[PDB]
């Protein structure tokens, strides 16, 4: 039925989308297209058979993890960064749940990150889980908890330069 996720555009009817979490609900309604077009995060969608009413989206923006140049009084730390990718929001229409759709996005999310991690040097797919319902879903699909903060899980990516 549904077809591959693709970047958001003004054309996708985003109006009739209810996902049970108003923050993620209002975000597509309000901040998704203006955000995605101004280039901060990049947002992907999936649609009914050939309908462009939208049933599931996810946004993923670049990000960076850094060694404090001064853990105290400007000590032996040199500028050291690491490219990485945040998966901000994954949300699916409250009435297409159960139909196995959330994993399907998460899987496309991972392939994409792996696709870019070849060209650019990104290293993990971070995500921030606020529910225990959400956190236990990400853990179930291989996201390890992060050592540096508790809300944040990540799916490390390791390959060759």
């Amino acid at each position: 039925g549904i077809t591959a996720p693709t970047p958001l555009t003004s054309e996708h009817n985003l109006a009739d989308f209810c996902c049970s979490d108003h923050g993620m609900n209002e975000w597509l309604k309000k901040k998704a297209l203006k955000n995605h077009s101004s280039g901060l995060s990049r947002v992907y969608v999936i649609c009914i058979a050939n309908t462009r009413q939208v049933i599931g989206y996810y946004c993923l923006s670049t990000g960076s993890i850094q060694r404090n140049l001064a853990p105290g009084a400007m000590r032996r730390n040199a500028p050291e960064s690491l490219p990485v990718v945040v998966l901000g929001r994954l949300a699916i229409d409250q009435a297409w749940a159960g139909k196995g759709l959330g994993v399907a996005l998460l899987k496309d999310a991972v392939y994409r990150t792996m696709s870019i991690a070849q060209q650019v040097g990104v290293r993990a797919l971070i995500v921030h889980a606020l529910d225990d319902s959400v956190r236990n879903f990400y853990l179930k699909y291989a996201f390890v908890p992060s050592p540096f903060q508790s809300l944040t899980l990540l799916y490390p990516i390791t390959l060759e330069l």
Binding site: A4, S41, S61, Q66, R67, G88, G100, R123, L151, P156
Partner: protein, 88 residues
Amino acid sequence: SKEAPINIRAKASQRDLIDMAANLVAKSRTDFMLDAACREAQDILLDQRLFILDDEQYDAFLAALDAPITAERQAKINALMNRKSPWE
């Protein structure tokens, strides 16, 4: 979750600003500002991209990436990548 009030010492101009807004969207002052706070609060935590960590923490992160994949972890990667998406 219990109901212990939050006192806000707002300037009179901003309190004025919130009320007219509220009226446009049929919300009480309380129900507008607490919805709004809630909403931005979650975005603030959900769209966080810069992590400046210390040494014990950045190594503890480098550790996490230099790891052999444990038997459970590989078996979850398996579950993710075997599921055939309905557009596939």
